[PDB]
Design a protein around this ligand. Structure first.
Ligand SMILES: Cn1cc(-c2ccnc(-n3ncc4cc(C(C)(C)C)cc(F)c4c3=O)c2CO)cc(NC(=O)[C@@H]2C[C@@H]2F)c1=O
Length: 264
């Protein structure tokens, strides 16, 4: 849906992402929004515009909503829901001494609900990770920038040997064959759970990307974080089966997480 740029008020800089500058503003003077200004050359724009209706129609409380676009000028804009506490990865690190384990499990539930919804729509995120989750003013985690990796023009990001490719969140079949599926999102979700329970540590820290690929291909897996119970670790570990068809669905993962909450 085409937003009238006259309805947007820019208020604050939010930094730079894969597609360039992002700003905080308001729509019609009332609703907080983030406005991506798509840097020319950074996105396959014709392809995104051609395919963007499905993305806007994804509607779930735990997705950072894509409200609309402005495409009748350059640079084009993507207008999304605004999340006052920013990126989950920074949020985990800034509050790491305060979180209770129940809050960490709730963050996992938030993301799993969003991914179950995307799964039910046969829609792949493709770059699920704590850096691509956001946190609102009440501590609710939502999944951000689902699907946009498909439109990135940046060889360092699109090549599996590039420095920006999400190697540490990728299953073997992505690293070897670029086989993206629901089950590669499952693998990434497990790594995300690990990020949450490690309070924002880098997966496979001190390994390079290629060393990470080599060693997960040989069965190396992330260790259990101190704050993860055995039941919680069993959930994240189930996401890392070498064979994609042995990995659970997000429906099953959500059931597992709710069972742990009930027991607690
Ligand atoms: C909705 N939103 C977005 C951002 C924000 C700002 C700058 N770059 C980004 N970015 N990052 C990463 C990113 C990644 C990708 C792929 C394709 C997956 C690689 C595509 C993107 F397009 C982006 C992007 O655009 C965002 C994420 O969309 C920040 C918010 N909030 C705050 O900063 C609060 C002040 C507190 F910290 C916010 O609410």
């Amino acid at each position: 849906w085409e937003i009238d740029p006259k309805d947007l008020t820019f208020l604050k800089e939010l930094g730079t992402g894969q597609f360039g500058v992002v700003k905080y503003g308001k729509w019609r003077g009332q609703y907080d929004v983030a406005i991506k200004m798509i840097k020319e050359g950074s996105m396959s724009e014709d392809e995104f515009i051609e395919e963007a209706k499905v993305m806007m129609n994804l509607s779930h409380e735990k997705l950072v909503q894509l409200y609309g676009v402005c495409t009748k000028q350059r640079p084009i804009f993507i207008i999304t829901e605004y999340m006052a506490n920013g990126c989950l990865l920074n949020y985990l690190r800034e509050m790491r001494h305060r979180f209770q384990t129940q809050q960490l499990l709730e963050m996992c539930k938030d993301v799993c609900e969003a991914m179950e919804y995307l799964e039910s729509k046969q829609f792949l995120h493709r770059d699920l990770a704590a850096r691509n989750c956001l946190v609102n003013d009440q501590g609710v985690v939502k999944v951000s920038d689902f699907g946009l990796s498909r439109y990135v023009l940046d060889d360092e990001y699109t090549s599996s040997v590039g420095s920006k490719f999400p190697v540490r969140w990728s299953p073997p079949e992505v690293l070897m064959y670029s086989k993206f599926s629901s089950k590669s999102d499952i693998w990434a979700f497990g790594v995300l759970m690990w990020e949450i329970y490690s309070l924002g540590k880098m997966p496979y820290e001190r390994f390079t990307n290629s060393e990470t690929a080599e060693h997960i291909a040989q069965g190396l897996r992330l260790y259990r974080p101190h704050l993860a119970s055995e039941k919680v670790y069993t959930i994240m570990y189930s996401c890392w089966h070498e064979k994609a068809d042995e990995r659970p669905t997000f429906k099953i993962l959500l059931s597992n997480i709710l069972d742990v909450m009930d027991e607690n």
